[PDB]
Design a protein around this ligand. Structure first.
Ligand SMILES: CCCCCCCCCCCCCCCCCC(=O)OC[C@H](COP(=O)([O-])OCC(O)COP(=O)([O-])OC[C@@H](COC(=O)CCCCCCCCCCCCCCCCC)OC(=O)CCCCCCCCCCCCCCCCC)OC(=O)CCCCCCCCCCCCCCCCC
Ligand SMILES: CC(C)=CCC/C(C)=C/CC/C(C)=C\CC/C(C)=C/CC/C(C)=C/CC/C(C)=C/CC/C(C)=C/CC/C(C)=C/CC/C(C)=C/CC1=C(C)C(=O)c2ccccc2C1=O
Ligand SMILES: CC(C)=CCC/C(C)=C/CC/C(C)=C\CC/C(C)=C/CC/C(C)=C/CC/C(C)=C/CC/C(C)=C/CC/C(C)=C/CC/C(C)=C/CC1=C(C)C(=O)c2ccccc2C1=O
Ligand SMILES: CC(C)=CCC/C(C)=C/CC/C(C)=C\CC/C(C)=C/CC/C(C)=C/CC/C(C)=C/CC/C(C)=C/CC/C(C)=C/CC/C(C)=C/CC1=C(C)C(=O)c2ccccc2C1=O
Ligand SMILES: CC(C)=CCC/C(C)=C/CC/C(C)=C\CC/C(C)=C/CC/C(C)=C/CC/C(C)=C/CC/C(C)=C/CC/C(C)=C/CC/C(C)=C/CC1=C(C)C(=O)c2ccccc2C1=O
Ligand SMILES: CC(C)=CCC/C(C)=C\CC/C(C)=C\CC/C(C)=C/CC/C(C)=C/CC/C(C)=C\CC/C(C)=C/CC/C(C)=C\CC/C(C)=C/CC1=C(C)C(=O)c2ccccc2C1=O
Ligand SMILES: CCCCCCCCCCCCCCCC(=O)O[C@H](COC(=O)CCCCCCC[C@@H](C)CCCCCCCCC)COP(=O)(O)O[C@H]1[C@H](O)[C@H](O)[C@H](O)[C@@H](O)[C@@H]1O
Ligand SMILES: CCCCCCCCCCCCCCCC(=O)O[C@H](COC(=O)CCCCCCC[C@@H](C)CCCCCCCCC)COP(=O)(O)O[C@H]1[C@H](O)[C@H](O)[C@H](O)[C@@H](O)[C@@H]1O
Ligand code: HEC
Ligand code: HEC
Ligand code: HEM
Lengths: 55, 107, 110, 223, 53
């Protein structure tokens, strides 16, 4: 569990600082990220998903 | 190098050191079985398990206690082990029952 | 996360020994049988702690879901091509995580 | 009226002689001798329905019985009159014992079952597969006398447990353990069949993962 | 055989002390496993020991 926790921390850090990938679409380029900000929306969706999985 | 050797040196054991006493000296664990004689001519019975613990967990067998289509598991008895009354004989018997090379099929 | 929480709960009742005992518990079809101390501790978790069977069942189901979700995530990463130039090392870390999860689940249910 | 096996040797002659012979001699093509066998073998083979058998192959399966109205007794007595095989247990009324064949110790019975019986059937008496066709059936619908006569007569490819290597208490305790293991609840929810992790993995993949992926499809947009 | 033996009043002088335990002869000596368990549970009880002066 300790090794797994360290590796998961490193994994999520690398994903956070190398921004996420995306699918080609209308306004998507290799130089921008199109989505929603964390602030109101993304934390909300993540927490609701957590609760549903626990359920 | 010295530190790592001292760290991983308490776990290493020799699999071939003679520790098991038999009738030709002492052997390695991986070649003795519990069916191995200990003093050159000892009698080892084919005892069977009864599933109860009043006195017998192991009892001797006769050739007539089986028909032409039967199978039975047997264990080495060594009458010097006795029934499971005292703690000493109880330890001996519980070590007979848990040995990975002891069981035998009688056809 | 759920695995961590339920395992921390479970560690308060488990005794990992291999010494032999006679059961003498509440489960009747096993009374008088000689068993190790770990098996008896698991039986005691199952039958004598209010809500222990529920917790160990959650633990096991969460382990299964952990493994399945890891495999589906790997399938996504592979098929969409999200492992290319900037992210090979992140792929490597994921592979190590997969191996460790397999062996951890094995050691757990043993 | 025990001096009447004229019935008996009225049904055998019209349902068995094509595969065992008129004198119970084992037609050298299909059937065994049936001389050393007794009433217990006939009872187990007919009451469970494995008898009179069609084509006959690696395992005769269990079917619906053909004979009752005390004619299983007729064939059993007729076959016992031509040999010295084992006999069916009886109660003080003359009927076949059901309740007297249940022991009182389930620990010893379960240990004996795990040592002698669980290898082919299961931990709790579900089925098991043998080589090249043959399998070991489920122990749920068999009553007590059928269990006793089964482990006493040793049917096809099942070993024969005499009354000298498995005494009568041992048999009664095994019967009691089997009948209790087939009739107990599952105190953890719906058990997925009695087997190990295969139904559990299937239920995971086909319930939990579809629920999770369906909620992921609902919450997140698709593009 | 004995981890516990009875006592007589003459087995002590005017300046002696001794620790004692409850016996209950139905416990017997420590030969079988049953009596051995009974005795090992007598020996470990936090309110059993007594000083005899
Ligand atoms: C361990 C177990 C943990 C469990 C797992 C969960 C943790 C995973 C992390 C997920 C989210 C990470 C969040 C985050 O990074 O925010 C950092 C964020 C830094 O933001 P930043 O300035 O943009 O990043 C620094 C550079 O600008 C960056 O600029 P850059 O674009 O040039 O990036 C260069 C980058 C390039 O290098 C990399 O990409 C590799 C990074 C891997 C590092 C190893 O190098 C770095 O900066 C790496 C930063 C490492 C810090 C975070 C790593 C910690 C996790 C490590 C786990 C073990 C390993 O720090 C914050 O301030 C967050 C706000 C919270 C503070 C509130 C304080 C309130 C008052 C306190 C009250 C006192 C009581
Ligand atoms: C005892 C025995 C019987 C069982 C014990 C088993 C054990 C696993 C209990 C689990 C309890 C566990 C903490 C349930 C979670 C409850 C949830 C998270 C409530 C919140 C859901 C929702 C209604 C509130 C909105 C959530 C938002 C607004 C804040 C919370 C929030 C959360 C919770 C995040 O995990 C998160 C992760 C990443 C980014 C952001 C967030 C975030 O904003
Ligand atoms: C088993 C056996 C018999 C004993 C069991 C117990 C045993 C293994 C104890 C552990 C032994 C082990 C930990 C030895 C450690 C010795 C290390 C520190 C040798 C390095 C010393 C060396 C001369 C100094 C040069 C290294 C410096 C320049 C860089 C490394 C470095 C280090 C090491 C920091 O701790 C550090 C902390 C905070 C900021 C930066 C640094 C940093 O740059
Ligand atoms: C595979 C083999 C060949 C089985 C197939 C049966 C065979 C005799 C005929 C199939 C006919 C075929 C050749 C033509 C095409 C048929 C058509 C494509 C549809 C049929 C496909 C079948 C039915 C899908 C299932 C096949 C099988 C391999 C799936 C295994 C699933 C595992 C074993 C589940 C395990 C499992 C078990 C065993 C339970 O007892 C249980 C009890 C209670 C709850 C859950 C379970 C549970 O999940
Ligand atoms: C995609 C990836 C595997 C490519 C790797 C690239 C490759 C070149 C690297 C080398 C790998 C080597 C050479 C060979 C790999 C083969 C094997 C030895 C690998 C070991 C571990 C491996 C890497 C794990 C990957 C397995 C794979 C990704 C599983 C994903 C399956 C898919 C995507 C699920 C989608 C949704 C799903 C179908 C919902 C429906 C449910 C169905 C029925 C799931 C089927 C199903 C499954 C999958 C069970 O595991 C299972 C287990 C026990 C009982 C039943 C089931 C069962 O029914
Ligand atoms: C301060 C205090 C502790 C001192 C104690 C004082 C002392 C005297 C008392 C002693 C008492 C001791 C013995 C015990 C005290 C504590 C004890 C009771 C704890 C034992 C276990 C206990 C029951 C645990 C309770 C806590 C529990 C209810 C809360 C759990 C909820 C938490 C852990 C959820 C966090 C989730 C996770 C770790 C955060 C990761 C960051 C988030 C999720 C972003 C993740 C994320 C990233 C990073 C992406 O890049 C990304 C990219 C694209 C899509 C998605 C994502 C995405 O989701
Ligand atoms: C991989 C295989 C390589 C093995 C190389 C070592 C060869 C020689 C060899 O292994 O023989 C033992 C000697 O061990 C050692 O020093 C081995 C240390 C080398 C560490 C290797 C680092 C990599 C002594 O026999 P033994 O009596 O069984 O061990 C007792 C004693 O270790 C000691 O009391 C204690 O460790 C006991 O646990 C015990 O078992
Ligand atoms: C030179 C080293 C290079 C060779 C590669 C290492 C291979 C492992 C060498 C190895 O362990 O092989 C045994 C040999 O044992 C030994 O004492 C050899 C001495 C230990 C050498 C390794 C220790 C490393 C330390 C010195 C550092 C075989 O004898 P044994 O294990 O007792 O099994 C049976 C009985 O001998 C039986 O009497 C006989 O009838 C045979 O059936 C069979 O040989
Ligand atoms: C040829 C078709 C066939 C018919 C019809 C048939 N049997 Fe059988 N019987 C067999 C075969 C084949 C076996 C061998 C057992 C096996 O392999 O399952 C057998 C076995 C038996 C056995 C057990 C033999 C043993 O050694 O334990 C008995 C008892 C028996 N039959 C009696 C009967 C009775 C009663 C009837 C109903 C009148 C009947 N048979 C009709 C083919 C037949
Ligand atoms: C794998 C070897 C094997 C062993 C060991 C074994 N069985 Fe069987 N058992 C079988 C086979 C094969 C059959 C099917 C015989 C038939 O259909 O004629 C069977 C049939 C039965 C049946 C009939 C089931 C029914 O529904 O009619 C019972 C009851 C039974 N066995 C009980 C036991 C008991 C009790 C033991 C332990 C003493 C035991 N068996 C050990 C293989 C075995
Ligand atoms: C991280 C991945 C983990 C996996 C895949 C995993 C898996 C498992 C599984 C499948 C079991 C069997 C439970 C049962 O059948 O009843 C188990 C048992 C157990 N786990 Fe975990 N586990 C994990 C983490 C942990 C952690 C972090 C802890 C403690 C901090 C823990 C503590 C325990 C304990 C004590 C048991 C034995 C208790 C019992 O069997 O009832 N586990 N594990």
């Amino acid at each position: 569990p300790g090794i797994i926790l360290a590796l998961i921390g490193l994994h999520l850090a690398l994903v956070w600082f190398q921004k996420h990938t995306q699918f080609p679409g209308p306004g998507r380029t290799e130089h921008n990220v199109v989505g929603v900000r964390v602030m109101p929306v993304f934390a909300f969706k993540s927490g609701a998903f957590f609760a549903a999985i626990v359920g | 190098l010295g530190t790592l050797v001292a760290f991983a040196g308490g776990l290493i054991k020799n699999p071939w050191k003679p520790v098991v006493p038999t009738a030709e000296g002492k052997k390695a664990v991986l070649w003795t079985s519990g069916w191995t004689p200990r003093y050159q001519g000892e009698t080892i019975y084919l005892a069977r398990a009864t599933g109860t613990e009043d006195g017998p967990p192991f009892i001797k067998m006769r050739p007539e206690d089986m028909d032409a289509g039967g199978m039975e598991t047997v264990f080495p008895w060594r009458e010097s082990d006795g029934d499971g009354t005292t703690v000493e004989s109880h330890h001996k018997l519980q070590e007979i029952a848990m040995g990975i090379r002891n069981p035998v099929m009688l056809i | 996360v759920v695995l961590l929480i339920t395992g921390v709960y479970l560690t308060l009742f488990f005794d990992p020994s291999m010494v032999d005992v006679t059961y003498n518990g509440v489960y009747q079809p096993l009374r008088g049988v000689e068993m190790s101390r770990a098996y008896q501790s698991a039986l005691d978790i199952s039958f004598e702690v209010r809500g222990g069977l529920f917790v160990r069942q959650i633990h096991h189901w969460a382990a299964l879901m952990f493994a399945a979700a890891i495999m589906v995530h790997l399938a996504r990463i592979f098929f969409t091509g999200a492992f290319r130039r900037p992210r090979e090392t992140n792929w490597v870390i994921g592979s190590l995580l997969l191996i460790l999860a397999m062996f951890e689940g094995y050691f757990g249910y043993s | 009226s025990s001096a009447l096996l004229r019935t008996g040797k009225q049904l055998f002659d019209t349902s068995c002689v094509s595969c065992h012979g008129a004198n119970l001699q084992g037609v050298p093509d299909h059937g065994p001798s049936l001389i050393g066998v007794g009433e217990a073998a006939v009872y187990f083979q007919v009451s469970t329905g494995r008898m009179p058998a069609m084509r006959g192959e690696a395992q005769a399966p269990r079917k619906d019985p053909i004979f009752d109205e005390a004619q299983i007794d007729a064939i059993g007595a007729y076959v016992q009159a031509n040999g010295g095989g084992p006999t069916v247990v009886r109660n003080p009324d003359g009927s076949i014992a059901t309740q007297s064949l249940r022991g009182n110790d389930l620990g010893r019975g379960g240990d004996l079952f795990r040592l002698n019986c669980a290898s082919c059937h299961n931990f709790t008496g579900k089925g098991g597969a043998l080589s090249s066709g043959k399998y070991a059936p489920d122990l749920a619908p068999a009553n007590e006398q059928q269990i006793l006569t089964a482990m006493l007569t040793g049917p096809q490819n099942m070993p024969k447990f005499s009354n000298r290597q498995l005494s009568f208490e041992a048999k009664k305790d095994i019967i009691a353990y089997v009948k209790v293991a087939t009739e107990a609840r599952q105190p953890g929810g719906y058990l997925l069949g009695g087997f190990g992790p295969a139904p559990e993995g299937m239920a995971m993949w086909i319930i939990g993962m579809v629920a999770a992926i369906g909620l992921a499809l609902w919450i997140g947009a698709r593009s």
